[PDB]
Amino acid sequence: SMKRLKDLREYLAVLEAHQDVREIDEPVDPHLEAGAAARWTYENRGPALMLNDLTGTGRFCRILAAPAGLSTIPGSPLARVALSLGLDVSATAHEIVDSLAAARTREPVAPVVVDSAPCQDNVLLGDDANLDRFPAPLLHEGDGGPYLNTWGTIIVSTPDGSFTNWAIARVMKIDGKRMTGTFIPTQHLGQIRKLWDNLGQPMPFAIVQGTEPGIPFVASMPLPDGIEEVGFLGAYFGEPLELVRAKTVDLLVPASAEIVIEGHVMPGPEYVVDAITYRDDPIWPISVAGEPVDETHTAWGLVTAAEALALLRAAKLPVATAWMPFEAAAHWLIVCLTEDWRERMPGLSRDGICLRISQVLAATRIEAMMTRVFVLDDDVDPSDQTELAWAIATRVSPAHGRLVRHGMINPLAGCYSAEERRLGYGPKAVLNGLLPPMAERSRRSSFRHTYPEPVRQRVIELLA
Amino acid sequence: SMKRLKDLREYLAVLEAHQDVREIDEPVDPHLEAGAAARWTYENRGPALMLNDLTGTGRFCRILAAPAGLSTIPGSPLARVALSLGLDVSATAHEIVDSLAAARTREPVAPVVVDSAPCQDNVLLGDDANLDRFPAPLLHEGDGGPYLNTWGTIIVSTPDGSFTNWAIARVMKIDGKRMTGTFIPTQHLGQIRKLWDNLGQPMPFAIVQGTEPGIPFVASMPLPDGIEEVGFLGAYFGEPLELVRAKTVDLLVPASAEIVIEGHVMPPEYVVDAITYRDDPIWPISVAGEPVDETHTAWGLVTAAEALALLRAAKLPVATAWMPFEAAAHWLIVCLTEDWRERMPGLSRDGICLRISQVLAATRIEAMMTRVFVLDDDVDPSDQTELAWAIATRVSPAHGRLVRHGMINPLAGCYSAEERRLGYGPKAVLNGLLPPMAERSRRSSFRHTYPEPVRQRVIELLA
Amino acid sequence: KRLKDLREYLAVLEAHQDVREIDEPVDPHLEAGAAARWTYENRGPALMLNDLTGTGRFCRILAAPAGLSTIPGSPLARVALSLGLDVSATAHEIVDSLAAARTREPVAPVVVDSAPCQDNVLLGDDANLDRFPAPLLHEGDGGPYLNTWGTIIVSTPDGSFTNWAIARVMKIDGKRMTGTFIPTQHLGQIRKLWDNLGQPMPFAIVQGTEPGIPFVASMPLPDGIEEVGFLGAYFGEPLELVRAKTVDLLVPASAEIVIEGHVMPPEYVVDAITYRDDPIWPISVAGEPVDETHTAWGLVTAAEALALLRAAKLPVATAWMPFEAAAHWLIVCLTEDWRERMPGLSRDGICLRISQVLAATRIEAMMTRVFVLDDDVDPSDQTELAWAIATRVSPAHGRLVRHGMINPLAGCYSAEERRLGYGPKAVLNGLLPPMAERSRRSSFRHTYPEPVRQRVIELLA
Amino acid sequence: SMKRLKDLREYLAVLEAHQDVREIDEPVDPHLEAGAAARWTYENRGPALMLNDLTGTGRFCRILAAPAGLSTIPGSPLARVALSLGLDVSATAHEIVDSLAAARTREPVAPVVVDSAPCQDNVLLGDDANLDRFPAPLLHEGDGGPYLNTWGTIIVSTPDGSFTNWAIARVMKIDGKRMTGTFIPTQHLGQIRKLWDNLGQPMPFAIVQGTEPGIPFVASMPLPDGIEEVGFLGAYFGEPLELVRAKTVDLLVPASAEIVIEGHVMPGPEYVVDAITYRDDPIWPISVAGEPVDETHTAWGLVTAAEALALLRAAKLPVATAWMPFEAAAHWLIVCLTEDWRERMPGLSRDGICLRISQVLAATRIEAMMTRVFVLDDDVDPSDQTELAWAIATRVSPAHGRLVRHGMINPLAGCYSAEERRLGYGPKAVLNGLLPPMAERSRRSSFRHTYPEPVRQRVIELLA
Ligand SMILES: [Mg+2]
Ligand SMILES: [Mg+2]
Ligand SMILES: [Mg+2]
């Protein structure tokens, strides 16, 4: 039933068919212009951009901007997300998070190793394996340097080869042979690196760009500790991902990649480039994070809502859907309960079920970033920004129904004081916007909710 | 400088010129279909509808649906509000509330009495003055009966004639001669009803429909106690309002009306004595419900303009004020000028929120403000995405909330049954102010993170 | 059993060994105030300071006139005796007596031909405040506080309303004094009427009256209620007054000293000072608990709250301003059957209603916190009260916050809240669930059958 | 410098010397009268009671009631606590918690094994080891049965013998050979019984009554996971505690005990008695928990404040003292900061230091029972109930300066709803009652704070 797109070329051919990708043949400077073009695209809900000619490297390597920004397809703003996750172009916000959460109840599917892949048609070794051959975009005026990895995946394995992590972490260019990035000890990349430091050996790595579109979504997903992204991807699409052996490092990489950067991480934390392999006419996708709406919101926040939905359902909570509204910049989670939630959780009041949701979320990886969690009924679509704001304004008390917890916070969230940020300790709220029992509720006043179907059908016939 | 539209025909001709009104010649049943057509229009941002043919009364009286709903005019969703208030079709949310607040600093302009008006071309008296000859729309399935007044103005004078109140209150049809409605004692209509009840005499009234488009906005405005709407309308437009004498009741009604329902209120039922109308009458309706309708575009908007005027009169550095339409007239956004600290030394962010709360709490409008968000003026409160982003990223999940308990809006949704029954519940003032300009982090977007040459080069490539 | 003057009051305290005479000289400059603080804080007897540096044995000073009593098992005895009750009257019986008088018609006073307070009469230059002690009660004060436990009689220009207020009056020199005339109080309002006519307001300050007067003088009665009428209704008989020698004002015949004068528009001016042989000038040295700020002002404010809450038909068993909370907290105890008496309300609902009723009254601004509790706890028992708040008030919910006018002297406000006169006040819900749904209390009285308790009392008491 | 009382007889001889113990020679019924006599004693601040004749067992076994209740010694209400912890009869609230916290910075002192002890002068085995030989007091109405362990220690060890826990937990009698009690998995006793259960073996146990008076205080103390109570006692007193081998179980028990009950815990959980040993004329102390003031407040709450003081100081916080007020029934912790706290914690505001205190406490075992923590200055004595209430009323804002955290709660605390108790999830607050800087403060108005020393000395001469 899934319609999985197997590489970036298939993804781009589907966006072409829906007139949702534009080619720019005029030269664009990776120094700020490429990043600015990506921001213009996100903010004006423009087509994805194929930057065909870049200052410094010419037409050698293309750049794909806004790979999963909001779509131009009429009535389908989530189309790039839907297609990236093998769903219909018009799949809803609920169908998307439900598909991802459903795969969390399935057994992982191991990948398969292929003899060859287009990502190894061109191989650069030794002094030829130089990043100066590719664009080094300075994405924002104030950045420390060029961010080479914003929509690509870092691949590392434990020394024993028992666990392989695919993660999306920012990587900054130092020079043609060296890059750097953060190895936070609370995430897998850093935990795996510590195992390589204990054995006194450089950690082999590979960074892939322009893989099949579903990979960066799963690489952004806060899966539990023992779950490999490749296995989850396999369970999600219902078939094994095809991997190819890296040329210089005993790692398996997606065969769908446009570019593969291979090397070793040395404490010097520096990534040292040993080889670069790429398919003919390579494409390097970028993601330019900032205010809504970009892949921070359409990918990272969205897959975090799908993980919350899976965790809440695993705790046997009657959750209809979960969503991280794009306008709230991945600061809010909306939890919608089924209409029969009281029958499914018999001893709890509205405050009681909010206490239980808080208790369940508080025990997970993702709790620290939830600055606010709004608990609402499923008569509200949390992906409809007007209906969501209306529900919060009219259903959340101005004083009560707020559960405040203090603890770890997202250091990048905006709603914290300087001392809260410095201590890494601040407030997170769970807000109760649930209504009284369905029979006790006042009828909703709108076209859909206040008129009989024959009257609505007659009006649609006259006006639509 | 204002471009006032003197009646409903001028208003409709301007909407026609901007392709923002659609004529429906097929019959529409006032029983639910008219209300449903109005809701479809609001919710799909459709053109205003001129319901030309209505079952029961045919083509006699027309109905105007979504008279001040969101506009179809590209890039100008507030165009119906702007044109209704004599402004340019493209006037912004700020220009609109600023125009209304500016008129609060001006002296009232007394109206002028004219000898005749089109609203009296046809006069029905005695048994002919029957509301069954006009449409009686059942606007929502669950309503108690037909709501005859939703976008019309009820004119009422004190027994001494020293004060003339123009108000917009709900009026439900009982039969062809009788209507009923709420006379809340905290409003001028319920306060003036207490003066005519004390004298044991019936209160004369006159309800007008389809007046010039600016009247229902001022009728909805919570002006201070001693301020007549007619005087404010005169100060706003910069010229006197032309009134005509009522045929049967000693009240001065707008000469721009389509229909004038004259009568007297018994000690609460409205009893019809006369119905005058101009040729080919138009009866506008407003079908209140979820965003966005005239509850939001008129009532909430004029309440933000009054808050802006009151806050400025208290010498507060308020750049703008707005009642977001998506929040259903439950929230007020107060944006402070960038130099508010220089203008209000030596208050902290919490200090200025305390002062705003203290000022608002002393006014008429405080009870309906379920939440007030105090933000900086780098946020447009009429941009729903930017507003939600500012609240999510700038209001603490726990602190910077001033809670006050007292009178509430009995129709607001965020109250318990006991809070509604007591008429006593919580109202919050939320602090979403940034630290000083120099201390602030740079905003990350196309406009805020790139040099002008880089933005201009990108606009050249992509626009 | 009303005590008609300060000598009757002092004779009753003597009979209960609750007053001590200090014949050794005490300096009005700080020592008298320090002796009063030692007394309050050590729950010592009231002090009769006979010899005072500067004036000697002329005018005596009564310290801790209504401080906590030394009488075993009766700490509220000075309050009880001051209000004509039994020496052992409880916290509840005291506030209930005062609240009961609020349901009664005022009793007009009677004018007598003479009084002991006019046995001596100083006029002109003889009317010098320097003849009497001028105590500097606290190190940091601006000057001597002459009025701390006396009453300021004032009438409107038309003579239709007479206010008996207790306000702080500071000595400037031998003839002039100064004090606060807050416009939200009667003394500031009655003053505005005299300013509108462009005339000085005649006044009269009395010291050492019958002990019940300073309690009613501290009570926040409604706007149209005279203090002398309430006193008359409280005691059930008219208050005997006398015409002031130099001003058109009637003053208590029970006074020790009467200081008559005029208020030029804020300074005061003395005309005459009349007194009875061997005068006594009582003082009140306000500070940390427990003094007359707590035993009189806070207590009478709880009695007024009890009267207002009952007038709103609320099932209030008692009300109290705990002394340890320095007149910052009001405790409202509901009757056990409150749910039957207020049928549609939840615990939160009755707290909303109490808040709504209190918010409409004069006294709301000083209630920094109001705790709504059941009547199974005594709010005058500081241990039981703290236990009830700790175990029954949620650490997060059941708090109704209101913002508005505040007591500018309350401690729990920021500098900006004080400067704006706008800050938070809370109503806390500490009500238990329905009587059947409750857990049994674990203590001697609540966990054991009466035969078992009686057998234990026989063995151990 | 310590003056340790090595058994209950030494403790009782010291209370006799201070006229703080009374003997009852008239028979007292263990069914409710003994418990009622203990409550009368606590509530009237009476002497400790030695009940010499108890209905059913006569003069065989005595009962000591209110072993650490408030003392009758003039000016020394904490004397039973002070003497129990080897301090002077007049040691203050601060000196007591400071002594206990100081021992937390010291190395544990291993105990010593002795050949014999008075607690084994009489040995009952087989059918003779029957609890019906001793009083079985029904302490309260509501109690499911007789509570045999209220002021005694439960001694258990791990199968490997690497860790020995001395615990004070509820033990209710079933019959003459069987008892039951709670084995909370969050405490050591339940964690240790799981290890015996995994080996398919009953857990050996010993319960001791009437040991030296310091033991029940340390058994109530929430020490960290790897710290044995016997080692802490040794470090506290500055000398090894003397133990004797148990007769029928492989455990070491205090040689100072009046009574040893030895046996094995079975899952079907029930304590089964295999031997009872006791010294001549045994004394069985009881603690009758209820409203203030009993050993719940004078021992458990007090040692929890000492542990909080030790943890806060280990986090380098400038804490002058910590205390759990007796009137607040072990629901509140008061944290008093030193006057110079701002100099010692330079970048923090009053709210900032409260956030830091909350963060430190939240990382510890004791967080859950802290329904409220009040952060005050050290110009307030938190053991003075009037001054404490005055400080909270006048210094804590009616709305702000409250940090709320949600999580684990004390299931026995009163201030929780039925749903919060059932979920084990509810609110806990940290309240900011700190004054502004010392120069910015208003002077305190009282005898001590508003008058010069010569004026105070002159007044004391006149009136004292
Ligand atoms: Mg991952
Ligand atoms: Mg008064
Ligand atoms: Mg332990």
Residues of A in contact with D351 (CB under 8 A): 419
CB-side neighbour CA atoms (13 Å) of C270: 29
Report CB contact under 8 Å: B402, C417: no
- The answer to the question of whether A2 is labelled as a binding residue is no
Ligand number, closest to the Cα atom of C227: 2
* Tokens representing residue A319 in the block: 């959750």
Q: Is B195 helix (H, G, I), strand (E, B) or coil?
A: helix
Residue in chain A lying closest to B323 (CA): A393
* A434 DSSP assignment: P
- In the chain, the amino acid numbered B435 is P
Residue in chain D lying closest to A355 (CA): D425
Report CB contact under 8 Å: B450, A32: yes
Q: How many CB atoms lie within 10 A of CB C259?
A: 28
Q: Closest Cα partner for B5 from B79, B114, B103? A: B79
Pairing of strands D242-245, D112-114: parallel
Handedness of CA C374, C375, C380, C383 (dihedral sign): negative
Contact predicate C129/C146, CB 8 Å:
yes
Contact predicate D249/D263, CB 8 Å:
yes
Q: In whole angstroms, give the CA distance from residue B307 to residue B356.
A: 10
C90 exposure class (CB count in 10 Å sphere: 0-12, 13-18, 19+): middle
- The answer to the question of whether C164 is labelled as a binding residue is yes
Mutation choice for A interface testing from B389, B395, B455 by most A CBs within 10 A = B389
Q: Closest Cα partner for A81 from A110, A41, A48, A107? A: A48
Q: Closest Cα partner for C290 from D386, D443, D393? A: D386
Residue D414's alpha-carbon distances to B46, C388, C432, D291, D365, in angstroms, are: 58, 9, 10, 11, 20
Q: Closest Cα partner for D166 from D214, D130, D118, D115? A: D214
3-state secondary structure chain C: CCCCCHHHHHHHHHHCCCEEEECCCECCECHHHHHHHHHHHCCCCEEEECCECCCECCCEEEECCCCCCCCCCCCCHHHHHHCCCCCCCCHHHHHHHHHHHCCCCCCCCEECCCCHHHCEEEEHHHCCHHHCCCCECCCCCCCCEEECCCEEEEECCCCCCEEEECCCEEECCCCEEEECCCCCCHHHHHHHHHHHCCCCEEEEEEECCCCCHHHHHHCCCCCCCCHHHHHHHHHCCCCEEEECCCCCCEEECCCCEEEEEEECCCEEEEEEEEECCCCEEECCCCCCCCCHHHHHHHHHHHHHHHHHHHHCCCCEEEEECCHHHCCCEEEEEECCCHHHHCCCCCHHHHHHHHHHHHHCCHHHHHCCEEEEEECCCCCCCHHHHHHHHHHHCCCCCCEEEEEECCCCCCCCCCHHHHHHCCEEEEEEECCCCCCCCCCCCCCHHHHCCHHHHHHHHHHHC
Pairing of strands C257-263, C201-207: antiparallel
Number of domains in chain D: 2
Q: Which experimental approach was used here?
A: X-ray
Q: In whole angstroms, give the CA distance from residue D34 to residue A325.
A: 64
C386/C238 same-domain check: no
Q: Which of A358, A423, A425 sits opposite D406 (nearest CB)?
A: A358
Q: Is D130 helix (H, G, I), strand (E, B) or coil?
A: coil
Contact predicate C235/C97, CB 8 Å:
no
With contact defined as 3+ CB pairs under 8 Å, the chains touching D are: A, B, C
With contact defined as 3+ CB pairs under 8 Å, the chains touching A are: B, C, D
Q: In whole angstroms, give the CA distance from residue B347 to residue B354.
A: 10
Residues of C in contact with B354 (CB under 8 A): 403, 416-417, 420, 422-423
Q: Is B270 helix (H, G, I), strand (E, B) or coil?
A: strand
Q: Distance from the CA of D189 to the center of ligand 3, in angstroms?
A: 9
| C379: alpha, beta or left? (left if phi > 0; alpha if psi -120 to 50) | alpha
- In the chain, the amino acid numbered B4 is R
**In the block, which residue shows the tokens 């009025």?**
C147
Give the start-end residues of each E strand in D158-256.
164-167, 171-173, 178-181, 203-209, 242-245, 252-254
A244/A351 same-domain check: no
Mutation choice for C interface testing from D25, D170, D377, D386 by most C CBs within 10 A = D386
Q: Which among B274, B306, B338 is the end of a domain? A: B306
CB-side neighbour CA atoms (13 Å) of D347: 8
Residue in chain C lying closest to D372 (CA): C395
Residues of A in contact with B288 (CB under 8 A): 445
Q: In whole angstroms, give the CA distance from residue C382 to residue C283.
A: 27
Q: Is D449 helix (H, G, I), strand (E, B) or coil?
A: helix
Q: Which residues have a Cβ under 8 Å from the Cβ of C264 and sit 6 or more positions away?
A: C200
Q: In whole angstroms, give the CA distance from residue C284 to residue C150.
A: 9
Report CB contact under 8 Å: D406, A407: no
Q: Which residues of chain A from 403 to 442 reach within 8 Å of chain C, CB to CB? A: 403-404
Q: Is B139 helix (H, G, I), strand (E, B) or coil?
A: coil
Residue in chain A lying closest to C397 (CA): A400
Contact predicate D69/D48, CB 8 Å:
yes
Report CB contact under 8 Å: D451, C401: no
* Tokens representing residue C33 in the block: 């105030």
Phi, psi (rounded to 5 degrees) for C51: -90, 120
Q: Closest Cα partner for A211 from A160, A272, A178, A260? A: A260
Using a CB–CB cutoff of 8 Å, tell me whether D39 touches chain C: yes
* Tokens representing residue C173 in the block: 């020199």
Residue A168's alpha-carbon distances to A211, A249, A284, D209, in angstroms, are: 12, 20, 14, 61
A416/A330 same-domain check: yes
Q: In whole angstroms, give the CA distance from residue C40 to residue D277.
A: 56
Report CB contact under 8 Å: B403, D399: yes
Q: In whole angstroms, give the CA distance from residue A350 to residue D421.
A: 16
A35/A98 same-domain check: yes
* β-pair partners for A402: A431
Report CB contact under 8 Å: A406, D358: yes
Q: How many CB atoms lie within 10 A of CB A190?
A: 15
Contact predicate B165/B228, CB 8 Å:
yes
Using a CB–CB cutoff of 8 Å, tell me whether B399 touches chain D: yes
A258/A398 same-domain check: no
Q: In whole angstroms, give the CA distance from residue B34 to residue A221.
A: 49
Q: Which residues have a Cβ under 8 Å from the Cβ of C438 and sit 6 or more positions away?
A: C432
Ligand number, closest to the Cα atom of A155: 1
Residues of D in contact with C329 (CB under 8 A): 393
B263/B316 same-domain check: no
Residues of D in contact with A355 (CB under 8 A): 406, 419-420, 423, 425-426
Ligand number, closest to the Cα atom of C166: 2
Q: In whole angstroms, give the CA distance from residue D149 to residue A2.
A: 64
Mutation choice for C interface testing from D53, D334, D376, D450 by most C CBs within 10 A = D450
Residue B34's alpha-carbon distances to A32, A52, A446, A458, B136, in angstroms, are: 54, 55, 13, 11, 10
For residue C364, give how far its alpha carbon lies from the nearest alpha carbon of chain B (Å): 13
Ligand number, closest to the Cα atom of A231: 1
Give the start-end residues of each E strand in A62-201.
62-65, 112-114, 122-125, 147-149, 153-157, 164-167, 171-173, 178-181
Residues of D in contact with B403 (CB under 8 A): 399
For residue D436, give how far its alpha carbon lies from the nearest alpha carbon of chain A (Å): 18
- The answer to the question of whether C185 is labelled as a binding residue is yes
Q: In whole angstroms, give the CA distance from residue A377 to residue A44.
A: 32
Q: In whole angstroms, give the CA distance from residue A340 to residue B124.
A: 56
With contact defined as 3+ CB pairs under 8 Å, the chains touching C are: A, B, D
Mutation choice for B interface testing from D350, D355, D400, D432 by most B CBs within 10 A = D400
Q: Which among D260, D287, D307 is the end of a domain? A: D307
C308 exposure class (CB count in 10 Å sphere: 0-12, 13-18, 19+): buried
Q: Which residues have a Cβ under 8 Å from the Cβ of C345 and sit 6 or more positions away?
A: B418, C339, C353
Element (H, E) at D351: helix D350-362
Q: Give the CA dihedral D379, D383, D389, D391, nearest 10 degrees.
A: 10
Q: Closest Cα partner for B461 from A290, A22, A45? A: A22
Q: Which among A307, A330, A346 is the end of a domain? A: A307
The resolution in angstroms reads 2.6
Report CB contact under 8 Å: D351, A419: yes
Q: Which residues have a Cβ under 8 Å from the Cβ of C415 and sit 6 or more positions away?
A: none
Q: Which of C348, C401, C416 sits opposite B354 (nearest CB)?
A: C416
Q: How many B×C Cβ pairs under 8 Å? A: 59
- The answer to the question of whether A283 is labelled as a binding residue is no
Q: Is B286 helix (H, G, I), strand (E, B) or coil?
A: coil
Q: Is D274 helix (H, G, I), strand (E, B) or coil?
A: strand
A378/A434 same-domain check: yes
Ligand number, closest to the Cα atom of A366: 1
Residues of C in contact with D404 (CB under 8 A): 395-396
Q: Is A209 helix (H, G, I), strand (E, B) or coil?
A: strand
Q: In whole angstroms, give the CA distance from residue C214 to residue C164.
A: 9
Q: In whole angstroms, give the CA distance from residue D221 to residue D70.
A: 19
* Tokens representing residue A283 in the block: 């494409």
Pairing of strands C399-404, C423-429: antiparallel
List, comma-separated, the residues after which chain B is broken, a break being a C to N distance over 2.5 A; otherwise answer none: 267
Contact predicate B322/B332, CB 8 Å:
yes
Q: In whole angstroms, give the CA distance from residue A64 to residue D76.
A: 80
Mutation choice for C interface testing from B316, B424, B429 by most C CBs within 10 A = B424
- Structural domain range at position B405: 307-463
- The answer to the question of whether A40 is labelled as a binding residue is no
- The answer to the question of whether C94 is labelled as a binding residue is no
Element (H, E) at B198: helix B188-198
Contact predicate B35/B137, CB 8 Å:
yes
Contact predicate C22/C28, CB 8 Å:
no
Q: Is D181 helix (H, G, I), strand (E, B) or coil?
A: strand
- In the chain, the amino acid numbered B162 is S
Report CB contact under 8 Å: D290, C322: no
* β-pair partners for D431: D374, D402
Contact predicate B381/B375, CB 8 Å:
yes
C45/C58 same-domain check: yes
- In the chain, the amino acid numbered A213 is P
* Tokens representing residue A387 in the block: 């209906």
Give the start-end residues of each E strand in D246-317.
252-254, 259-266, 270-278, 283-285
Report CB contact under 8 Å: A404, C396: yes
C227 exposure class (CB count in 10 Å sphere: 0-12, 13-18, 19+): buried
Q: In whole angstroms, give the CA distance from residue B304 to residue B325.
A: 11
3-state secondary structure A333-376: EEEEECCCHHHHCCCCCHHHHHHHHHHHHHCCHHHHHCCEEEEE
Q: In whole angstroms, give the CA distance from residue D261 to residue D257.
A: 10
Element (H, E) at A313: helix A302-314
Residues of D in contact with B398 (CB under 8 A): 403-404
Q: In whole angstroms, give the CA distance from residue D113 to residue C444.
A: 42
Q: In whole angstroms, give the CA distance from residue A32 to residue A65.
A: 13
- The answer to the question of whether A168 is labelled as a binding residue is yes
B394/B423 same-domain check: yes
A312/A299 same-domain check: no
C312/C249 same-domain check: no
- The answer to the question of whether A219 is labelled as a binding residue is yes
Ligand number, closest to the Cα atom of A218: 1
D83/D192 same-domain check: yes
Q: In whole angstroms, give the CA distance from residue D38 to residue D288.
A: 6
- The answer to the question of whether D393 is labelled as a binding residue is no
Residue in chain A lying closest to D418 (CA): A352
List, comma-separated, the residues after which chain D is broken, a break being a C to N distance over 2.5 A; otherwise answer none: 268
